[PDB]
């Protein structure tokens, strides 16, 4: 299942503290094995040195088959664990 996938392979790309994610697909007339459809949080220290957009925008053009290879549309939210242990 694609979250377990995006879970490991996000694990081999960016090296994660945390993770707080789901698919929405479950909402369209989709095929079977069909999960086109999901959203993400993730906590690294690998995005920390950058604006919030900025560090969106690199994973967004690095990364748009490492986060969105099996899936046709999805959305994140990415954090450092420093904000994540107080706040967020």
Do not use: C, D
């Amino acid at each position: 299942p694609v979250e377990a996938a995006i879970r490991t392979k996000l694990e081999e790309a960016l090296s994660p503290e945390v993770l707080e994610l789901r698919n929405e697909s479950g909402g369209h007339a989709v095929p079977p094995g069909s999960e086109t459809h999901f959203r993400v949080a993730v906590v690294s220290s690998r995005f920390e040195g950058l604006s919030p957009l900025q560090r969106h925008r690199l994973v967004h053009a690095a990364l748009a088959e490492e986060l969105g290879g099996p899936v046709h549309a999805l959305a994140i939210q990415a954090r450092t664990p420093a904000q994540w242990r107080e706040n967020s």
